């Protein structure tokens, strides 16, 4: 853990293979959504042929990851406490398996929903789970893997858009499957949100460690 020299943030970082399984899966999704009749209808609710791939190709270059605690080398609030935790120290470099339950896209971000296990939640902080919809959403609902971003969109947006998506998905206001994609059921949630509920949970290998950049 380097009890002294802290990273920019902790989190689960996907291996080279899992990273492309998810990365390429997220591309074909954006390729299907952009060519799907449902999405084409409500396009004015989302903005030529708007190729979603290029639209979401602004993510900061780097390895796909599910962040836990942003530390800023200890300058971020709570960083020192999180790193000094025994579970965090005893998990550095340990490999975990992250479950991807669904893909999603909004006018701002395009990400993947992560369903953390009981032990993975031991590393989930208790500050990154109380924005606006986290009240009534369970702990760890913000867990995600950012796959894409619009022009001026910070990756932190992806977690909030997920909570926005889940807040409606819980309220039964997602509606009915507007279509069945090869991977799962497409759902139109209005206000630009979309979800590909994966019929089969995508399993991705990931290592919990710190990133210094």
């Amino acid at each position, epitope marked *: 853990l380097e009890k002294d020299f802290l990273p920019l943030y902790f989190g689960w970082f996907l291996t080279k293979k899992s990273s492309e399984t998810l990365r390429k899966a997220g591309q074909v999704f954006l390729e299907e959504l952009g060519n799907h009749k449902a999405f084409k209808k409500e396009l004015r609710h989302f903005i030529e042929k708007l190729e979603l791939v*290029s639209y979401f190709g602004k993510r900061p*270059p780097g390895v796909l990851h599910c962040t836990t605690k942003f530390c800023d080398y200890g300058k971020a609030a709570g960083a020192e406490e999180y790193a000094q935790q025994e579970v965090v120290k005893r998990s550095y470099g340990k490999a975990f398996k992250l479950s991807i339950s669904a893909l999603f896209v909004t006018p701002k971000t395009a990400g993947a929903q992560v369903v953390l296990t009981d032990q993975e939640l031991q590393l989930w902080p208790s500050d990154l789970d109380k924005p606006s919809a986290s009240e009534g959403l369970p702990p760890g609902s913000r867990a995600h893997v950012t796959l894409g971003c619009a022009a001026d969109v910070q990756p932190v947006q992806t977690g909030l858009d997920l909570l926005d998506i889940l807040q409606q998905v819980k309220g039964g206001s997602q509606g009915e499957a507007v279509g069945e994609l090869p991977r799962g059921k497409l759902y139109s949630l209005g206000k630009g949100r979309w979800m590909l509920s994966l019929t089969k949970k995508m399993e991705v290998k990931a290592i919990f460690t710190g990133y210094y950049g």
Partner: nanobody
Amino acid sequence: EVQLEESGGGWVHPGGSLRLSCAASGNVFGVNTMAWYRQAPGKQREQRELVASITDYGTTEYADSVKGRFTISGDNAKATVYLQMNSLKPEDTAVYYCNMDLTVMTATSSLYAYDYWGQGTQVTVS
């Protein structure tokens, strides 16, 4: 401890094509960016100009001088990049160096982003 290894390059008459590749050997955890710079005959290395770039996401940036003639490819899984050059001009003569912003895992499992350079590949157009 990664090593960048170029390939391709040669002597071509104006209007030909070569495919410059560049793999990465070692303990690379992931690729963040892959690019191709070039240094013309005479230049000093301080004047290495960007020729083509590619991101993990697949976003490409090119130089107008080559945009439409060259085409950068990629493969994050094998840490390999390609630069298929088309309709080559004499002004394209240079040594094409391979750049790679990569994430690498230290022994303590920590992750860092490193910038690696390649030795070079000779490209001649005449």
